Design brief:
With 207 residues, the chain is mainly beta. It has helices spanning 18-29, 82-94; strands at residues 7-10, 48-52, 56-60, 63-67, 69-70, 75-76, 104-110, 116-119, 131-137, 140-144, 154-158, 163-166, 175-177, 192-198. The protein has one domain (1-207): Alpha-ketoglutarate-dependent dioxygenase AlkB-like (Jelly Rolls), CATH 2.60.120.590. Strands 1-12-9-14-7-2 form a six-stranded antiparallel beta sheet, with helices on one face. It has a four-stranded antiparallel beta sheet with strand order 8-13-10-11, with no helix packed on it. It is globular, with a radius of gyration of 16 Å. Bound molecules: fe (ii) ion. This is Alpha-ketoglutarate-dependent dioxygenase AlkB.
């Protein structure tokens, strides 16, 4: 029996691909800079973000959505790097999702003390498609609950190279990241990067 129904934890799965993945995060950031987006309550997120791929998650007039254009540059988000595409496919396939074809990758950067409040990934057209998570750099405590608010939370440390394929029931769980502890990592220096691959466009975009 699993810790999270439908989730597939692949520890250190991206450990070897880590250095290249980071070079690509930096490349993506040179075009679409990391920016701290504004929350519903008007607060600035402590986590900094950016996207790559055809679609990118962002804020838009009191709402949140996937856009083919970066509002900060008025240009498309950078294309999905080969390292990203490859790693995701290998993880998705190993987890039993060979047809998963993400068109969006939200890149999160956590500086010491950065955290992500509880939320569900429900902005995607088809929730049967999983979300592949890739952690890099400083370790973080990932928390997840259930399908509804105020449900009992479970914690899980996510470390450098860890990949989790959130499929099945786990795909809809409320989740977040507790305040990042300060520290040092050879490849990221003083932060943690997290990539979350999503199939954000409707199936028609595949034809
Ligand atoms: Fe999320």
């Amino acid at each position: 029996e699993p810790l999270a129904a439908g989730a597939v934890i692949l520890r250190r799965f991206a450990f070897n691909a880590a250095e290249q993945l980071i070079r690509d995060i930096n490349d993506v950031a040179s075009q679409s800079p990391f920016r701290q987006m504004v929350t519903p309550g008007g607060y600035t997120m402590s986590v900094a973000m950016t996207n790559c791929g055809h679609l990118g998650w962002t804020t838009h007039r009191q709402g949140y959505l996937y856009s083919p254009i970066d509002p900060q540059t008025n240009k498309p988000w950078p294309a999905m790097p080969q390292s990203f595409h490859n790693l995701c496919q290998r993880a998705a396939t190993a987890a039993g999702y060979p047809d998963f074809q993400p068109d969006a990758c939200l890149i999160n950067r956590y500086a010491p003390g950065a955290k992500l409040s509880l939320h569900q990934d429900k902005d995607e057209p088809d929730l049967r498609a999983p979300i592949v998570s890739v952690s890099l750099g400083l370790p973080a405590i990932f928390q997840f609950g259930g399908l509804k608010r105020n449900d009992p939370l479970k914690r899980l440390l996510l470390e450098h190279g860890d990949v989790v394929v959130w499929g099945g029931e786990s795909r809809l769980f409320y989740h977040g990241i507790q305040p990042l502890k300060a520290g040092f990592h050879p490849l990221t220096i003083d932060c943690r990067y997290n990539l979350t691959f999503r199939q954000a466009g409707k199936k028609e975009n595949l034809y």
